[PDB]
PDB file of C-alpha atoms in Angstrom:
ATOM      1  CA  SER A   1     -24.411   3.443 -10.248  1.00 53.98           C
ATOM      2  CA  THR A   2     -22.400   3.008  -7.080  1.00 55.09           C
ATOM      3  CA  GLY A   3     -18.867   2.121  -6.039  1.00 53.41           C
ATOM      4  CA  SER A   4     -17.363   0.689  -2.854  1.00 50.98           C
ATOM      5  CA  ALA A   5     -13.639   0.341  -2.098  1.00 50.15           C
ATOM      6  CA  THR A   6     -11.674  -0.593   0.979  1.00 52.00           C
ATOM      7  CA  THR A   7      -9.168   1.926   2.281  1.00 52.67           C
ATOM      8  CA  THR A   8      -6.151   0.677   4.260  1.00 56.62           C
ATOM      9  CA  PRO A   9      -3.750   2.494   6.626  1.00 53.22           C
ATOM     10  CA  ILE A  10      -0.240   2.783   5.172  1.00 50.50           C
ATOM     11  CA  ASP A  11       1.448   2.091   8.508  1.00 48.20           C
ATOM     12  CA  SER A  12       0.865   1.270  12.177  1.00 46.33           C
ATOM     13  CA  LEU A  13       0.100   4.927  13.019  1.00 44.92           C
ATOM     14  CA  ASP A  14      -2.617   5.519  10.394  1.00 44.58           C
ATOM     15  CA  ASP A  15      -0.420   8.237   8.861  1.00 46.06           C
ATOM     16  CA  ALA A  16      -2.524   8.005   5.686  1.00 47.87           C
ATOM     17  CA  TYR A  17      -4.867   5.588   3.932  1.00 49.55           C
ATOM     18  CA  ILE A  18      -4.568   4.038   0.475  1.00 46.64           C
ATOM     19  CA  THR A  19      -7.373   2.864  -1.788  1.00 45.90           C
ATOM     20  CA  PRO A  20      -6.854   0.798  -4.947  1.00 48.36           C
ATOM     21  CA  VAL A  21      -7.826   2.558  -8.185  1.00 46.57           C
ATOM     22  CA  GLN A  22      -7.969   1.030 -11.679  1.00 45.22           C
ATOM     23  CA  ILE A  23      -6.581   3.284 -14.428  1.00 46.30           C
ATOM     24  CA  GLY A  24      -6.521   2.554 -18.138  1.00 43.36           C
ATOM     25  CA  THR A  25      -7.120  -0.422 -20.410  1.00 39.64           C
ATOM     26  CA  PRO A  26      -6.075  -3.043 -19.462  1.00 39.73           C
ATOM     27  CA  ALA A  27      -6.393  -1.830 -15.892  1.00 38.53           C
ATOM     28  CA  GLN A  28      -3.327  -0.579 -14.056  1.00 34.89           C
ATOM     29  CA  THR A  29      -4.078  -0.660 -10.325  1.00 38.09           C
ATOM     30  CA  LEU A  30      -2.450   2.082  -8.254  1.00 37.63           C
ATOM     31  CA  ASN A  31      -2.932   2.717  -4.535  1.00 40.65           C
ATOM     32  CA  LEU A  32      -4.028   6.320  -4.146  1.00 38.30           C
ATOM     33  CA  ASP A  33      -4.486   8.613  -1.156  1.00 40.73           C
ATOM     34  CA  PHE A  34      -8.090   9.854  -1.310  1.00 39.77           C
ATOM     35  CA  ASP A  35      -7.913  13.500  -0.269  1.00 42.03           C
ATOM     36  CA  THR A  36     -11.043  15.538   0.474  1.00 45.93           C
ATOM     37  CA  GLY A  37      -8.758  18.567   0.903  1.00 43.51           C
ATOM     38  CA  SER A  38      -7.541  18.758  -2.714  1.00 43.61           C
ATOM     39  CA  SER A  39      -8.896  18.340  -6.214  1.00 42.22           C
ATOM     40  CA  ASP A  40      -6.219  16.749  -8.425  1.00 41.11           C
ATOM     41  CA  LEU A  41      -5.974  13.058  -9.336  1.00 41.34           C
ATOM     42  CA  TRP A  42      -2.241  12.623  -9.912  1.00 39.87           C
ATOM     43  CA  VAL A  43      -0.055   9.554 -10.179  1.00 39.61           C
ATOM     44  CA  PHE A  44       3.507   8.381 -10.231  1.00 38.85           C
ATOM     45  CA  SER A  45       4.120   7.460 -13.849  1.00 38.41           C
ATOM     46  CA  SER A  46       6.526   6.365 -16.558  1.00 43.30           C
ATOM     47  CA  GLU A  47       7.191  10.130 -16.928  1.00 44.57           C
ATOM     48  CA  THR A  48       8.298  10.645 -13.309  1.00 41.02           C
ATOM     49  CA  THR A  49      11.969  11.602 -12.915  1.00 37.48           C
ATOM     50  CA  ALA A  50      13.606   8.234 -12.262  1.00 38.06           C
ATOM     51  CA  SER A  51      15.553   9.338  -9.180  1.00 38.18           C
ATOM     52  CA  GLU A  52      12.265  10.461  -7.593  1.00 38.91           C
ATOM     53  CA  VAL A  53      10.638   7.011  -7.831  1.00 38.13           C
ATOM     54  CA  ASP A  54      11.445   4.610  -4.978  1.00 37.38           C
ATOM     55  CA  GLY A  55       9.098   1.622  -4.833  1.00 35.55           C
ATOM     56  CA  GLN A  56       5.838   3.182  -6.064  1.00 35.55           C
ATOM     57  CA  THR A  57       3.686   1.548  -8.697  1.00 34.30           C
ATOM     58  CA  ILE A  58       3.615   3.717 -11.814  1.00 34.75           C
ATOM     59  CA  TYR A  59       0.985   4.473 -14.448  1.00 34.38           C
ATOM     60  CA  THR A  60       2.302   3.970 -17.986  1.00 33.60           C
ATOM     61  CA  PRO A  61      -0.077   5.729 -20.373  1.00 31.88           C
ATOM     62  CA  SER A  62       1.571   4.226 -23.472  1.00 28.35           C
ATOM     63  CA  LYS A  63       0.344   0.806 -22.270  1.00 29.42           C
ATOM     64  CA  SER A  64      -3.280   1.964 -22.001  1.00 30.35           C
ATOM     65  CA  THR A  65      -5.369   1.782 -25.169  1.00 30.53           C
ATOM     66  CA  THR A  66      -7.791   4.352 -23.733  1.00 30.97           C
ATOM     67  CA  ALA A  67      -5.198   6.956 -22.649  1.00 27.29           C
ATOM     68  CA  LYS A  68      -5.047  10.218 -24.573  1.00 24.68           C
ATOM     69  CA  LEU A  69      -2.669  13.118 -23.985  1.00 25.84           C
ATOM     70  CA  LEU A  70      -4.614  16.228 -22.983  1.00 26.57           C
ATOM     71  CA  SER A  71      -2.657  18.468 -25.302  1.00 26.23           C
ATOM     72  CA  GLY A  72      -1.014  21.478 -23.725  1.00 27.31           C
ATOM     73  CA  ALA A  73      -2.292  20.776 -20.216  1.00 25.68           C
ATOM     74  CA  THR A  74       0.032  20.972 -17.227  1.00 26.34           C
ATOM     75  CA  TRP A  75      -0.456  20.860 -13.475  1.00 27.35           C
ATOM     76  CA  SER A  76       1.454  21.847 -10.358  1.00 23.90           C
ATOM     77  CA  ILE A  77       0.336  21.553  -6.764  1.00 22.46           C
ATOM     78  CA  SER A  78       1.687  22.411  -3.340  1.00 20.49           C
ATOM     79  CA  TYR A  79       0.158  20.904  -0.222  1.00 21.22           C
ATOM     80  CA  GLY A  80      -0.231  22.265   3.293  1.00 22.63           C
ATOM     81  CA  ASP A  81       2.581  20.048   4.541  1.00 26.20           C
ATOM     82  CA  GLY A  82       5.052  21.622   2.099  1.00 25.13           C
ATOM     83  CA  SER A  83       5.111  18.730  -0.360  1.00 25.23           C
ATOM     84  CA  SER A  84       4.502  19.210  -4.076  1.00 24.48           C
ATOM     85  CA  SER A  85       4.292  17.599  -7.476  1.00 24.91           C
ATOM     86  CA  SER A  86       3.781  18.609 -11.114  1.00 23.28           C
ATOM     87  CA  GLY A  87       3.532  17.265 -14.639  1.00 22.94           C
ATOM     88  CA  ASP A  88       1.302  16.839 -17.682  1.00 25.98           C
ATOM     89  CA  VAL A  89      -2.148  15.311 -18.188  1.00 27.73           C
ATOM     90  CA  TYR A  90      -3.859  12.373 -19.861  1.00 31.44           C
ATOM     91  CA  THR A  91      -7.494  11.425 -19.980  1.00 33.06           C
ATOM     92  CA  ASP A  92      -8.275   7.777 -19.330  1.00 29.60           C
ATOM     93  CA  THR A  93     -10.799   5.392 -17.799  1.00 30.25           C
ATOM     94  CA  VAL A  94     -10.697   5.348 -13.996  1.00 31.98           C
ATOM     95  CA  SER A  95     -12.610   2.947 -11.773  1.00 32.22           C
ATOM     96  CA  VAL A  96     -12.990   2.932  -7.991  1.00 34.71           C
ATOM     97  CA  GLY A  97     -14.675  -0.007  -6.318  1.00 33.57           C
ATOM     98  CA  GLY A  98     -16.663  -0.867  -9.434  1.00 34.08           C
ATOM     99  CA  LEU A  99     -17.637   2.716 -10.345  1.00 35.33           C
ATOM    100  CA  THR A 100     -16.209   3.775 -13.707  1.00 32.53           C
ATOM    101  CA  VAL A 101     -15.563   7.233 -15.131  1.00 33.56           C
ATOM    102  CA  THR A 102     -14.468   7.607 -18.735  1.00 32.08           C
ATOM    103  CA  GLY A 103     -12.419  10.621 -19.789  1.00 28.94           C
ATOM    104  CA  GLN A 104     -11.099  11.317 -16.288  1.00 28.24           C
ATOM    105  CA  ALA A 105      -8.119  13.674 -16.111  1.00 30.33           C
ATOM    106  CA  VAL A 106      -5.170  11.636 -14.843  1.00 27.06           C
ATOM    107  CA  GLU A 107      -2.339  13.983 -13.961  1.00 28.32           C
ATOM    108  CA  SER A 108       1.000  12.321 -14.670  1.00 24.37           C
ATOM    109  CA  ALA A 109       3.847  13.427 -12.418  1.00 22.28           C
ATOM    110  CA  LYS A 110       7.092  14.504 -14.006  1.00 22.36           C
ATOM    111  CA  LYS A 111       8.382  15.725 -10.624  1.00 22.60           C
ATOM    112  CA  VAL A 112       7.484  14.929  -7.031  1.00 25.08           C
ATOM    113  CA  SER A 113       8.982  16.291  -3.807  1.00 24.55           C
ATOM    114  CA  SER A 114      11.039  14.221  -1.421  1.00 23.79           C
ATOM    115  CA  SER A 115       8.222  13.273   0.950  1.00 23.56           C
ATOM    116  CA  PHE A 116       6.362  11.567  -1.901  1.00 22.70           C
ATOM    117  CA  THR A 117       9.474   9.726  -3.100  1.00 22.39           C
ATOM    118  CA  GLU A 118      10.170   8.570   0.442  1.00 22.67           C
ATOM    119  CA  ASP A 119       6.720   7.055   0.855  1.00 21.60           C
ATOM    120  CA  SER A 120       6.743   3.878  -1.214  1.00 23.49           C
ATOM    121  CA  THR A 121       3.147   3.013  -0.271  1.00 20.86           C
ATOM    122  CA  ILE A 122       1.404   5.985  -1.927  1.00 19.30           C
ATOM    123  CA  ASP A 123       1.218   5.881  -5.736  1.00 17.09           C
ATOM    124  CA  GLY A 124      -0.575   9.241  -6.042  1.00 20.31           C
ATOM    125  CA  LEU A 125      -3.556  11.241  -4.797  1.00 21.50           C
ATOM    126  CA  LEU A 126      -7.230  11.258  -5.731  1.00 20.80           C
ATOM    127  CA  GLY A 127      -8.726  14.629  -4.866  1.00 22.34           C
ATOM    128  CA  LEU A 128     -12.279  14.859  -3.560  1.00 19.27           C
ATOM    129  CA  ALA A 129     -12.573  18.573  -2.712  1.00 19.94           C
ATOM    130  CA  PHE A 130     -14.396  20.898  -5.117  1.00 20.75           C
ATOM    131  CA  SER A 131     -13.216  21.089  -8.725  1.00 19.28           C
ATOM    132  CA  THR A 132     -12.607  24.834  -8.380  1.00 18.15           C
ATOM    133  CA  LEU A 133      -9.298  23.894  -6.663  1.00 17.84           C
ATOM    134  CA  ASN A 134      -8.065  21.707  -9.532  1.00 14.25           C
ATOM    135  CA  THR A 135      -4.668  22.951 -10.744  1.00 11.42           C
ATOM    136  CA  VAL A 136      -4.732  21.885 -14.404  1.00 11.73           C
ATOM    137  CA  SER A 137      -3.896  24.746 -16.776  1.00  9.64           C
ATOM    138  CA  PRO A 138      -5.068  26.200 -19.098  1.00  6.17           C
ATOM    139  CA  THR A 139      -8.297  24.175 -18.834  1.00  8.75           C
ATOM    140  CA  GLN A 140      -9.277  23.236 -15.274  1.00  8.39           C
ATOM    141  CA  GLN A 141     -10.384  19.623 -14.860  1.00 10.57           C
ATOM    142  CA  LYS A 142     -13.073  17.899 -12.794  1.00 11.18           C
ATOM    143  CA  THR A 143     -12.572  15.519  -9.892  1.00 11.16           C
ATOM    144  CA  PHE A 144     -13.511  11.857 -10.107  1.00 11.24           C
ATOM    145  CA  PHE A 145     -16.556  12.553  -7.917  1.00 11.00           C
ATOM    146  CA  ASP A 146     -17.662  15.527 -10.004  1.00 11.72           C
ATOM    147  CA  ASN A 147     -17.427  13.410 -13.179  1.00  9.00           C
ATOM    148  CA  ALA A 148     -19.281  10.460 -11.594  1.00 11.73           C
ATOM    149  CA  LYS A 149     -21.945  12.448  -9.793  1.00 13.96           C
ATOM    150  CA  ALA A 150     -24.710  12.531 -12.379  1.00 12.04           C
ATOM    151  CA  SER A 151     -24.499   8.739 -12.838  1.00 14.05           C
ATOM    152  CA  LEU A 152     -24.594   7.962  -9.127  1.00 14.50           C
ATOM    153  CA  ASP A 153     -27.753   6.685  -7.452  1.00 11.52           C
ATOM    154  CA  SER A 154     -27.370   9.597  -5.011  1.00 12.94           C
ATOM    155  CA  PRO A 155     -24.837  12.452  -5.376  1.00 12.76           C
ATOM    156  CA  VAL A 156     -22.785  11.500  -2.320  1.00 10.77           C
ATOM    157  CA  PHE A 157     -19.692   9.730  -1.161  1.00 11.00           C
ATOM    158  CA  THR A 158     -18.886   8.499   2.341  1.00 11.13           C
ATOM    159  CA  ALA A 159     -15.667   8.093   4.308  1.00  6.78           C
ATOM    160  CA  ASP A 160     -15.510   5.389   6.963  1.00  8.09           C
ATOM    161  CA  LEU A 161     -11.882   5.366   8.077  1.00  9.64           C
ATOM    162  CA  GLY A 162     -10.629   2.739  10.512  1.00  7.89           C
ATOM    163  CA  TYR A 163      -8.512   3.117  13.617  1.00  5.32           C
ATOM    164  CA  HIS A 164      -5.514   0.867  13.030  1.00  5.15           C
ATOM    165  CA  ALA A 165      -7.761  -1.093  10.630  1.00  2.76           C
ATOM    166  CA  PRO A 166      -9.170  -0.932   7.090  1.00  2.00           C
ATOM    167  CA  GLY A 167     -12.264   1.096   6.291  1.00  2.00           C
ATOM    168  CA  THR A 168     -14.397   2.025   3.296  1.00  2.00           C
ATOM    169  CA  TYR A 169     -15.061   4.731   0.718  1.00  2.00           C
ATOM    170  CA  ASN A 170     -18.517   4.405  -0.867  1.00  2.00           C
ATOM    171  CA  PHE A 171     -19.821   6.372  -3.839  1.00  2.00           C
ATOM    172  CA  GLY A 172     -23.486   6.893  -4.611  1.00  2.00           C
ATOM    173  CA  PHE A 173     -25.131   5.393  -1.520  1.00  2.00           C
ATOM    174  CA  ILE A 174     -25.243   5.548   2.258  1.00  2.00           C
ATOM    175  CA  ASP A 175     -24.627   2.190   3.940  1.00  3.99           C
ATOM    176  CA  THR A 176     -27.121   2.317   6.790  1.00  3.35           C
ATOM    177  CA  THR A 177     -25.387  -0.660   8.453  1.00  2.00           C
ATOM    178  CA  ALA A 178     -22.080   1.224   8.788  1.00  2.00           C
ATOM    179  CA  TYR A 179     -23.023   3.605  11.617  1.00  2.24           C
ATOM    180  CA  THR A 180     -24.993   3.760  14.846  1.00  5.99           C
ATOM    181  CA  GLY A 181     -27.803   6.160  15.673  1.00  9.16           C
ATOM    182  CA  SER A 182     -28.590   8.899  13.174  1.00  9.70           C
ATOM    183  CA  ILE A 183     -26.541  11.036  10.789  1.00  8.00           C
ATOM    184  CA  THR A 184     -26.443  14.729  11.708  1.00  7.79           C
ATOM    185  CA  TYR A 185     -26.094  17.005   8.709  1.00  6.83           C
ATOM    186  CA  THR A 186     -24.449  20.405   8.863  1.00  8.98           C
ATOM    187  CA  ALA A 187     -23.954  23.281   6.401  1.00  6.05           C
ATOM    188  CA  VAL A 188     -20.958  23.546   4.071  1.00  5.19           C
ATOM    189  CA  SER A 189     -19.293  26.588   2.555  1.00  4.93           C
ATOM    190  CA  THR A 190     -17.617  25.898  -0.771  1.00  2.71           C
ATOM    191  CA  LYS A 191     -16.136  29.405  -0.972  1.00  2.58           C
ATOM    192  CA  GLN A 192     -12.557  28.209  -0.423  1.00  2.00           C
ATOM    193  CA  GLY A 193     -13.066  24.989  -2.438  1.00  2.00           C
ATOM    194  CA  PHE A 194     -13.124  22.772   0.652  1.00  2.00           C
ATOM    195  CA  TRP A 195     -15.702  20.786   2.584  1.00  2.00           C
ATOM    196  CA  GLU A 196     -15.760  23.620   5.105  1.00  2.00           C
ATOM    197  CA  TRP A 197     -18.172  23.494   8.036  1.00  2.00           C
ATOM    198  CA  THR A 198     -18.606  24.829  11.584  1.00  2.00           C
ATOM    199  CA  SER A 199     -18.355  22.575  14.609  1.00  2.00           C
ATOM    200  CA  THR A 200     -20.507  23.622  17.555  1.00  2.00           C
ATOM    201  CA  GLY A 201     -17.868  23.044  20.246  1.00  3.80           C
ATOM    202  CA  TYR A 202     -15.787  20.560  22.153  1.00  2.00           C
ATOM    203  CA  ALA A 203     -15.139  18.678  25.369  1.00  2.00           C
ATOM    204  CA  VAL A 204     -11.966  17.183  26.842  1.00  2.00           C
ATOM    205  CA  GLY A 205     -12.356  13.766  28.448  1.00  2.00           C
ATOM    206  CA  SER A 206     -15.324  13.668  30.796  1.00  2.00           C
ATOM    207  CA  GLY A 207     -15.352  17.464  31.034  1.00  2.00           C
ATOM    208  CA  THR A 208     -18.212  19.789  30.286  1.00  2.00           C
ATOM    209  CA  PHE A 209     -18.977  20.677  26.682  1.00  2.64           C
ATOM    210  CA  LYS A 210     -17.857  24.142  25.574  1.00  2.00           C
ATOM    211  CA  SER A 211     -20.239  25.670  23.044  1.00  2.00           C
ATOM    212  CA  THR A 212     -18.158  27.605  20.547  1.00  2.00           C
ATOM    213  CA  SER A 213     -18.126  27.833  16.754  1.00  2.00           C
ATOM    214  CA  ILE A 214     -15.072  26.237  15.134  1.00  2.00           C
ATOM    215  CA  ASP A 215     -14.865  26.668  11.364  1.00  2.00           C
ATOM    216  CA  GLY A 216     -12.747  24.025   9.660  1.00  2.00           C
ATOM    217  CA  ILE A 217     -12.422  21.553   6.819  1.00  2.00           C
ATOM    218  CA  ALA A 218     -13.150  17.839   6.622  1.00  2.00           C
ATOM    219  CA  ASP A 219      -9.858  16.620   5.164  1.00  2.00           C
ATOM    220  CA  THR A 220      -9.138  12.923   4.707  1.00  2.00           C
ATOM    221  CA  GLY A 221      -5.680  13.767   3.337  1.00  2.00           C
ATOM    222  CA  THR A 222      -4.465  15.336   6.593  1.00  3.32           C
ATOM    223  CA  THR A 223      -3.387  12.928   9.345  1.00  2.79           C
ATOM    224  CA  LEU A 224      -4.036  15.000  12.479  1.00  4.41           C
ATOM    225  CA  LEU A 225      -6.672  17.245  14.052  1.00  6.44           C
ATOM    226  CA  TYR A 226      -5.629  20.918  13.875  1.00  6.96           C
ATOM    227  CA  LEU A 227      -7.646  23.283  16.072  1.00  6.88           C
ATOM    228  CA  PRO A 228      -7.287  26.745  17.630  1.00  8.88           C
ATOM    229  CA  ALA A 229      -4.488  27.137  20.153  1.00  7.37           C
ATOM    230  CA  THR A 230      -6.941  27.757  22.988  1.00  4.09           C
ATOM    231  CA  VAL A 231      -8.712  24.424  22.375  1.00  6.14           C
ATOM    232  CA  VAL A 232      -5.464  22.500  21.950  1.00  6.63           C
ATOM    233  CA  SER A 233      -3.976  23.962  25.143  1.00  4.46           C
ATOM    234  CA  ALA A 234      -7.115  22.958  27.056  1.00  4.21           C
ATOM    235  CA  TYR A 235      -6.745  19.379  25.791  1.00  6.79           C
ATOM    236  CA  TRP A 236      -3.033  18.918  26.563  1.00  6.84           C
ATOM    237  CA  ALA A 237      -3.376  20.564  29.984  1.00  5.49           C
ATOM    238  CA  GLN A 238      -5.179  17.366  31.000  1.00  6.19           C
ATOM    239  CA  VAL A 239      -2.113  15.214  30.216  1.00  5.92           C
ATOM    240  CA  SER A 240       0.633  15.257  32.845  1.00  4.57           C
ATOM    241  CA  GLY A 241       3.941  16.249  31.337  1.00  5.16           C
ATOM    242  CA  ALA A 242       2.559  17.292  27.946  1.00  8.08           C
ATOM    243  CA  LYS A 243       4.153  20.359  26.381  1.00 10.11           C
ATOM    244  CA  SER A 244       4.506  22.163  23.103  1.00 11.61           C
ATOM    245  CA  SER A 245       7.959  21.595  21.668  1.00  8.87           C
ATOM    246  CA  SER A 246       9.229  24.021  19.040  1.00  6.12           C
ATOM    247  CA  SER A 247      12.111  21.643  18.277  1.00  7.32           C
ATOM    248  CA  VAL A 248       9.797  18.702  17.580  1.00  6.35           C
ATOM    249  CA  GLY A 249       7.113  20.838  15.916  1.00  5.24           C
ATOM    250  CA  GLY A 250       4.108  20.513  18.196  1.00  2.00           C
ATOM    251  CA  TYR A 251       2.693  19.012  21.346  1.00  2.00           C
ATOM    252  CA  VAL A 252       4.439  15.971  22.757  1.00  2.00           C
ATOM    253  CA  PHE A 253       3.528  13.924  25.790  1.00  2.00           C
ATOM    254  CA  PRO A 254       5.042  11.140  27.919  1.00  2.00           C
ATOM    255  CA  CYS A 255       4.559   7.803  26.199  1.00  2.00           C
ATOM    256  CA  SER A 256       3.510   6.449  29.623  1.00  2.00           C
ATOM    257  CA  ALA A 257       0.371   8.635  29.599  1.00  2.00           C
ATOM    258  CA  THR A 258      -3.214   7.543  29.245  1.00  2.11           C
ATOM    259  CA  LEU A 259      -4.764  10.143  26.910  1.00  2.00           C
ATOM    260  CA  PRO A 260      -8.249  11.574  27.488  1.00  2.00           C
ATOM    261  CA  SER A 261     -10.867  11.489  24.749  1.00  2.00           C
ATOM    262  CA  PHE A 262     -11.804  14.571  22.748  1.00  2.00           C
ATOM    263  CA  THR A 263     -15.390  15.352  21.743  1.00  2.00           C
ATOM    264  CA  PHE A 264     -16.440  17.655  18.916  1.00  2.00           C
ATOM    265  CA  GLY A 265     -19.901  18.975  18.176  1.00  3.78           C
ATOM    266  CA  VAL A 266     -21.885  18.541  14.971  1.00  4.83           C
ATOM    267  CA  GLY A 267     -25.018  20.560  15.532  1.00  3.78           C
ATOM    268  CA  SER A 268     -26.551  19.144  18.707  1.00  6.15           C
ATOM    269  CA  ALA A 269     -24.752  15.810  18.143  1.00  6.77           C
ATOM    270  CA  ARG A 270     -21.383  14.796  19.520  1.00  8.85           C
ATOM    271  CA  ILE A 271     -18.521  12.725  18.052  1.00 10.65           C
ATOM    272  CA  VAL A 272     -16.118  11.216  20.577  1.00  8.89           C
ATOM    273  CA  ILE A 273     -12.490  10.638  19.590  1.00 12.28           C
ATOM    274  CA  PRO A 274     -11.032   8.007  21.969  1.00 15.47           C
ATOM    275  CA  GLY A 275      -7.757   8.956  23.632  1.00 13.31           C
ATOM    276  CA  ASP A 276      -5.846   6.198  21.856  1.00 14.29           C
ATOM    277  CA  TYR A 277      -6.650   7.821  18.495  1.00 14.84           C
ATOM    278  CA  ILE A 278      -4.607  10.845  19.634  1.00 16.30           C
ATOM    279  CA  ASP A 279      -1.380   8.837  20.164  1.00 18.22           C
ATOM    280  CA  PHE A 280       1.104   9.102  17.262  1.00 19.84           C
ATOM    281  CA  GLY A 281       3.868   7.261  19.044  1.00 20.15           C
ATOM    282  CA  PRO A 282       7.504   8.010  19.803  1.00 23.35           C
ATOM    283  CA  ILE A 283       8.911  11.152  18.202  1.00 23.98           C
ATOM    284  CA  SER A 284      11.929   9.090  17.102  1.00 21.23           C
ATOM    285  CA  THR A 285      12.581   5.382  17.426  1.00 25.71           C
ATOM    286  CA  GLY A 286      12.986   4.371  21.071  1.00 25.93           C
ATOM    287  CA  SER A 287      12.029   7.749  22.514  1.00 26.45           C
ATOM    288  CA  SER A 288       9.728   8.011  25.531  1.00 29.02           C
ATOM    289  CA  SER A 289       8.347  11.289  24.165  1.00 28.82           C
ATOM    290  CA  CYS A 290       5.258  10.691  22.031  1.00 26.41           C
ATOM    291  CA  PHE A 291       3.726  12.936  19.369  1.00 29.86           C
ATOM    292  CA  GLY A 292       0.212  14.247  19.863  1.00 28.55           C
ATOM    293  CA  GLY A 293      -2.627  13.823  17.415  1.00 31.31           C
ATOM    294  CA  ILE A 294      -4.295  17.146  18.276  1.00 30.41           C
ATOM    295  CA  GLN A 295      -2.164  20.120  17.257  1.00 30.53           C
ATOM    296  CA  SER A 296      -2.562  23.866  16.900  1.00 28.46           C
ATOM    297  CA  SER A 297      -3.797  25.323  13.621  1.00 26.85           C
ATOM    298  CA  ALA A 298      -2.237  28.691  14.463  1.00 26.82           C
ATOM    299  CA  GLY A 299      -0.284  29.784  11.420  1.00 27.40           C
ATOM    300  CA  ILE A 300      -2.016  27.281   9.092  1.00 28.80           C
ATOM    301  CA  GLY A 301      -4.809  29.767   8.588  1.00 29.19           C
ATOM    302  CA  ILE A 302      -7.555  27.142   8.821  1.00 28.73           C
ATOM    303  CA  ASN A 303      -8.717  24.457  11.239  1.00 27.93           C
ATOM    304  CA  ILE A 304      -8.475  20.923   9.864  1.00 28.98           C
ATOM    305  CA  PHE A 305     -10.632  17.977  10.868  1.00 27.65           C
ATOM    306  CA  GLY A 306      -8.162  15.410   9.581  1.00 24.73           C
ATOM    307  CA  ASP A 307      -8.088  11.647   9.979  1.00 26.86           C
ATOM    308  CA  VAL A 308      -7.861  11.719  13.800  1.00 25.56           C
ATOM    309  CA  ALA A 309     -11.326  13.276  13.865  1.00 32.21           C
ATOM    310  CA  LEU A 310     -12.868  11.694  10.786  1.00 31.54           C
ATOM    311  CA  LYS A 311     -11.979   8.113  11.698  1.00 32.96           C
ATOM    312  CA  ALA A 312     -14.157   8.471  14.831  1.00 32.96           C
ATOM    313  CA  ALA A 313     -17.199   8.964  12.565  1.00 32.69           C
ATOM    314  CA  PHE A 314     -19.085   7.787   9.522  1.00 34.29           C
ATOM    315  CA  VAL A 315     -18.878  10.882   7.289  1.00 33.61           C
ATOM    316  CA  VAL A 316     -21.208  11.773   4.423  1.00 31.74           C
ATOM    317  CA  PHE A 317     -19.930  14.160   1.757  1.00 30.93           C
ATOM    318  CA  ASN A 318     -23.223  15.259   0.211  1.00 30.60           C
ATOM    319  CA  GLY A 319     -22.639  16.747  -3.227  1.00 30.93           C
ATOM    320  CA  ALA A 320     -26.216  17.801  -3.882  1.00 32.18           C
ATOM    321  CA  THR A 321     -26.822  21.212  -5.473  1.00 31.13           C
ATOM    322  CA  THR A 322     -26.304  22.709  -2.024  1.00 30.63           C
ATOM    323  CA  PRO A 323     -23.587  20.521  -0.490  1.00 32.36           C
ATOM    324  CA  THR A 324     -23.697  19.438   3.154  1.00 32.92           C
ATOM    325  CA  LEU A 325     -21.703  17.173   5.488  1.00 32.23           C
ATOM    326  CA  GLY A 326     -23.135  14.419   7.654  1.00 33.38           C
ATOM    327  CA  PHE A 327     -21.570  12.806  10.717  1.00 32.92           C
ATOM    328  CA  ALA A 328     -22.653   9.705  12.624  1.00 31.99           C
ATOM    329  CA  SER A 329     -21.072   7.732  15.423  1.00 32.35           C
ATOM    330  CA  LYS A 330     -20.099   4.142  14.582  1.00 35.71           C
TER     331      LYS A 330
END
């Protein structure tokens, strides 16, 4: 089997992407944030504290003839950005782009933190990291991909995120029309539960390539590119007037700037992030200070190849017995 679903930016900045997901019988379609940095499929629901729902579409398990309470199971998750959610668990039928999993754990939120409430466009998350990170207790549950994998034509999924435009998540096949040149594959460590890999270096604009190993995670659920302070300083030094602002919470730059590109290495291959992808717009409405899309990972504890980086590539998440990651230009 295969599946193919369009993923759509939630706003004009590509702050996140939503993908429609069918849950239950009859189907209830929710728009979920596909997150290769976590491993829980959780939804706003009829169980979510009413004051914490503000415009989201909810899953109502009592209206699904295939929903079953997973007795005694609870979940609770905290994300890198400080947000969180928790609740109980049902199993139900879940379909993405025509690919169906029966008995998928659907984690129903009883509580969500303010940032989730405040984002009316995201109805929940669909985790695509390794199932070892799943938070369900006392019986850990599998991701949608893990459950689907054996049925797929090939044990892979691909992320093809758009810049200010829709893109695609495919399951079970590689669309050879969706990228240019060849796909370069690189090793993955699953030791921390992430799609963790090592970039071979970087360049700023038309500058020379610096060969240096940068360990980090491919994370579709993180907006920005978080890299070591040395790398980030080298980038922003090429933008007149750019500075790190403790009050704003990272590098800012004059909105009048033209940003240089940023290149990262994948083996001997190179992925170029155009400068415009690095512009996250005014820090507050009407400001002439703009927020940068490349930020320091210092104090996160890990480098994160988030959407800024991934949307410059066609990315293969290869879930073979020994997982790997592939990157192609597009």
